Amino acid sequence: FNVAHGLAWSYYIGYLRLILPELQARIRTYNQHYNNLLRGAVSQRLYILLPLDCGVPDNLSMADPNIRFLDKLPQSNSIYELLENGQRAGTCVLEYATPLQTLFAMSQYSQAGFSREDRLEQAKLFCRTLEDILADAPQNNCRLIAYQEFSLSQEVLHHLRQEEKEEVTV
Amino acid sequence: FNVAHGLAWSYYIGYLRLILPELQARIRTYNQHYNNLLRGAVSQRLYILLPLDCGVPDNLSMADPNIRFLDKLPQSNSIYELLENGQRAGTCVLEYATPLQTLFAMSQYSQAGFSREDRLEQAKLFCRTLEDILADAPQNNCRLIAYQEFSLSQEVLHHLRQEEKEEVTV
Numbered sequence: 051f052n053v054a055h056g057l058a059w060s061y062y063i064g065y066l067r068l069i070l071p072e073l074q075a076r077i078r079t080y081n082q083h084y085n086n087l088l089r090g091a092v093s094q095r096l097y098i099l100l101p102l103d104c105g106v107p108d109n110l111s112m113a114d115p116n117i118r119f120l121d122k123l124p125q126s127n128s129i130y131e132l133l134e135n136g137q138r139a140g141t142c143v144l145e146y147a148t149p150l151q152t153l154f155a156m157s158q159y160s161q162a163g164f165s166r167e168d169r170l171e172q173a174k175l176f177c178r179t180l181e182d183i184l185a186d187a188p189q190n191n192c193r194l195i196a197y198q199e200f201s202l203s204q205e206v207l208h209h210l211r212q213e214e215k216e217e218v219t220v
Numbered sequence: 221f222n223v224a225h226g227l228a229w230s231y232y233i234g235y236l237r238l239i240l241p242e243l244q245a246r247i248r249t250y251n252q253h254y255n256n257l258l259r260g261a262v263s264q265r266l267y268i269l270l271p272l273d274c275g276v277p278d279n280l281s282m283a284d285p286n287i288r289f290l291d292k293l294p295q296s297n298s299i300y301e302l303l304e305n306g307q308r309a310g311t312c313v314l315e316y317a318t319p320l321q322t323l324f325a326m327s328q329y330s331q332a333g334f335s336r337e338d339r340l341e342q343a344k345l346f347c348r349t350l351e352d353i354l355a356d357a358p359q360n361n362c363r364l365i366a367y368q369e370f371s372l373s374q375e376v377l378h379h380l381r382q383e384e385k386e387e388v389t390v
């Protein structure tokens with residue numbers, strides 16, 4: 051009995067599969083304006099945060115004050131700026147894997163018998179299953195950032211700078 | 221690997237658990253008006269259709285023309301009238317188990333390797349898991365109507381008349 055299997059398939063089938071095909075076109079359109087205004091570029095991939103403690107807050111800034119909402123990507127998703135010593139070090143479309151909230155709610159529902167360690171195992175299994183799904187899916191369109199709570203903004207920036215290095219080298 | 225386990229838990233945790241506690245109060249409020257206007261009563265339970273073929277249409281009437289949308293239950297869900305030879309034989313809050321659509325989408329996604337028989341097994345497992353969950357959940361608030369495609373309206377009416385007989389006998 052592994053709820054993560056169905057949660058991952060549901061998340062992909064009913065959300066990621068629908069959002070990812072148009073994502074890059076939407077970001078290219080946004081970046082024509084963003085490059086004109088700020089001489090930079092929003093990253094092209096959807097970054098999905100997978101906190102293995104299943105703690106999804108209302109506002110990303112609550113998890114790290116160097117992660118601040120910047121703007122809405124039209125047609126919607128949220129663009130966040132990533133700060134270093136008060137400077138914009140990076141920009142990306144960032145959001146939590148919402149099925150993790152189901153795992154958290156289950157661990158607080160006493161009739162489930164779903165312990166805290168159960169939640170952790172299932173959150174790990176959720177990450178591995180989603181990676182397997184995305185690996186075969188019609189991409190290079192999104193990145194899973196799984197972490198056990200360290201700076202979350204620094205971990206995102208790690209990925210954003212690696213994405214740019216891949217962009218310009220291959 | 222059984223996607224139905226996580227689909228059922230997700231459906232309960234993120235939807236049924238939220239809707240069921242207030243349902244009866246909402247229907248009692250509606251029925252004060254409905255009894256005044258039509259001298260009858262809407263049934264008190266949420267009826268969840270579980271077509272084992274995972275065929276969830278846009279309009280319930282497409283599945284059976286004796287099932288017609290009647291009105292919105294405020295605060296929302298849809299109230300349907302059940303017809304027999306053109307007469308209102310019953311009234312209830314009726315809706316499909318939407319996770320079944322995830323099963324259907326998976327069977328049409330060739331990289332899943334999720335065959336038609338896989339879909340059937342998982343849809344059955346989804347019904348049994350949901351029943352187990354509801355059995356322990358804090359109720360008598362909803363009824364699962366699983367069926368393999370016969371009149372769907374007659375099957376719903378079967379349940380509605382059994383509910384009323386239970387209401388007046390115990």
Ligand SMILES: CS(=O)(=O)c1ccc(C(=O)Nc2c(C(=O)O)oc3ccc(Cl)cc23)cc1
Nearest residue numbers: 075076077079080081083084087123124125
């Ligand atoms: C149909 S689409 O391809 O998904 C699509 C995707 C992105 C955008 C978009 O960024 N618009 C922007 C508008 C506007 O629209 O007035 O003003 C802007 C000012 C600054 C920036 Cl940085 C962007 C915009 C528009 C359409």
Ligand SMILES: CS(=O)(=O)c1ccc(C(=O)Nc2c(C(=O)O)oc3ccc(Cl)cc23)cc1
Nearest residue numbers: 245246247249250251253254257293294295
């Ligand atoms: C806050 S609540 O308990 O969820 C709640 C639940 C149900 C209703 C409700 O049926 N209203 C109705 C109103 C109105 O509201 O004007 O007119 C009506 C005419 C006919 C019927 Cl048959 C019902 C209503 C209202 C509140």
